Amino acid sequence: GETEEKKKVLTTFTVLADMVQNVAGDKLVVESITRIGAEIHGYEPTPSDIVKAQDADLILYNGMNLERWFEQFLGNVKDVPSVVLTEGIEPIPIADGPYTDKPNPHAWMSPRNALVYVENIRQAFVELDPDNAKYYNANAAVYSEQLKAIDRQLGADLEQVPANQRFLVSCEGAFSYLARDYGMEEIYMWPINAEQQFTPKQVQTVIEEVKTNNVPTIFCESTVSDKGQKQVAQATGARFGGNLYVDSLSTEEGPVPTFLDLLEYDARVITNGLLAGTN
Template structure:
């Protein structure tokens, strides 16, 4: 990949969480420095920025955020930057048609987890590419080449997921999770969806009513396995599995990558890992 201009300092791009940072690095190559505000494994909905986050952000040349009410702390964060420097901000879900949340306190609001659809991820990448070309026109060739290559990789993973998940018997295409973070994935691959709570910021355990509704759904539909996300406690969903006579099928990843030594160090690996976990959970007897 091309290097930044010799002797010139790379411009800094700040993202709100690790998945956006990974996408951005794939487009930036060596031309820009990309930093995530939240760290690997962090719960991003209710994140509380630290003083060091604010200090680091003041040196940024561009901020990328998800939008769709995901980073509810973000407006307050940018308001604390000060310093007289207006940092351009790009919302990466611009151009995506959101799925509305169907229940509870967030009913009717957009589901923010749009990146869980590889098809939507292509829109993220295009928005990143355009933002980078505007930020650093000299790197346009690098950004355009990298964006095309990365988009091709996303399309290949989309085809893999379609192949894997379409192998599920129609009666077993049900995805039960703690957070309603998989609506876009479920839509893309023909899965029905049930969850304890719609957004992590609302809960981390599940109310008795939420637990009962999911237990009933699992029993009535004879769903063989349930799952939960890596950034929240597993107790509520393990209770659902026990009461409904299902098995706990494993941990899914959605809001955060792991570090380089973990199981999902990149966005594309995250998608593949989740698909494999879902497939194994719903088909293993």
């Protein structure tokens, strides 16, 4: 009597992938629809993506319209349970552009929020695989504990840059939750990823705001263009920080190979970017 196989949980992108894989341990086999630095807001699902979902015992997604392409994707697969890892989180509405004041989906950029992400991942696993409950709870318990610990570090990290200098300018406004948590003023080229290609007025606005605040370093993300941000960089003298990570982790090489890494790093390169470097 063979013990049989392990459940297949599918997730929309690489960040959620690392989160779930940390609550599943070796009990479940986790897979992610998208591969590394890919625009996840409007990714087009290949046939393989469709077939996977069909042969997956559970599909976990962010919700809050993060993966605009989900509703459709899930539409063409029979009864494969689906749960939104975002349930419980009180959203921050979008500022402008299309999706005017709809929910900002980037809630996982808030360690405080990441905790409810992990509770829901946990709950779905005990129902999906009741036998391995113990493990999932032991995993989540350990995982939750690290979130809290890094949360302390994040807060103790950003409070360095004085209150009236805590300006986090970026490409997409994905760091809104991280900003609210650690009292920062956000400055972005566009609210959320959409029709996009942004506009010269959006970059124009970013151009003045940086000046009306003397932000020494400005960043962008590893999933969107940097052609727009750099302009504001070499036309405002602000130092162009590298890429911050939100909608996708990185490789085994490079930084941000794990979500927890993602938090420590983003904030770490943010804190010292707002410290010196005006001229």
